[PDB]
Design a protein around this ligand. Sequence first.
Ligand SMILES: Cc1cc(Cl)c(C)n2nc(CCc3nc(N4CCCC4)nn3C)nc12
Ligand SMILES: [Mg+2]
Ligand SMILES: [Zn+2]
Length: 313
Amino acid sequence: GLMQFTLPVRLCREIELFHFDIGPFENMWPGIFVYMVHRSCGTSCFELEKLCRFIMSVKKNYRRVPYHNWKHAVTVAHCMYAILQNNHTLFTDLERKGLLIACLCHDLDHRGFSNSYLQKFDHPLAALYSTSTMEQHHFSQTVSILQLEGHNIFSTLSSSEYEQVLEIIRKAIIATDLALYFGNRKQLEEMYQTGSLNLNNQSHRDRVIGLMMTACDLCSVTKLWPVTKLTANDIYAEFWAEGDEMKKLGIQPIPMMDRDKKDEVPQGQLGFYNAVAIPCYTTLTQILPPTEPLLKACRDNLSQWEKVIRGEE
Ligand SMILES: Cc1cc(Cl)c(C)n2nc(CCc3nc(N4CCCC4)nn3C)nc12
Ligand SMILES: [Mg+2]
Ligand SMILES: [Zn+2]
């Protein structure tokens, strides 16, 4: 009732920053997440007992893969928290509620394989969800966990509010399908430039939330360089295992997934920051000026990859 969550001083201060790293102590991550809900939403948003039980079931449904794991979920939520806290007035009570939850749940039960590998392996999920395969699965898992006894953190919401929140969550989670991001950022680019962008048009909010989700999801590129570099190892550990699996199916994997192309990593990161990351944080900074530190950090890390290529590290 009168129970606050507090973090040690360095965390208390640094968690407010975009480049915060949640650290290696897994047992502190639930507390960190709850801390973020309480400041971002209010101590009255969710029934504490239910929330903790929800957090633990979510944790239990992430798998021990090198990248798309429980640490990633909490990291993507922390980036969303920073966005929300730096844009206080722009978001409904329901969005604040739904978005941190969406981030925590966005990769639920990920297996460490891309949509493309599932389709080529012909996994049951690819038959059930022909596009955004994993992402529809992630949302499905969120609904399941929400329906477990004592797990309904949205129990105090009205029937229509409940339906609205699940709908924010659904679209948010779908938007993490990077294949959808390009078209989404293009529309947003154009709408901002022709001045048509309207935060009262619901379909416009959706696109903006979608862009936020991409930004949070890629936030590894906005951290301090050693964090960025070390996460990159986890990212390729997954991709290369998928690459191996492609080869097992009799298929040349794309260069990104082929461990024989280890040497081109610095250059693959370059293309990635240029094709994906920078454009994402750019348009996001245009639409939401106080998120500029993400762009600035992303640019610093691109420069670090450039330095890696030039033999300077
Ligand atoms: C989804 C995602 C998210 C994030 Cl936060 C990052 C930092 N990354 N990096 C990547 C791989 C980029 C890449 N590497 C390569 N190759 C070709 C041969 C050597 C490497 N090509 N590309 C496009 N993906 C992601
Ligand atoms: Mg995902
Ligand atoms: Zn993700």
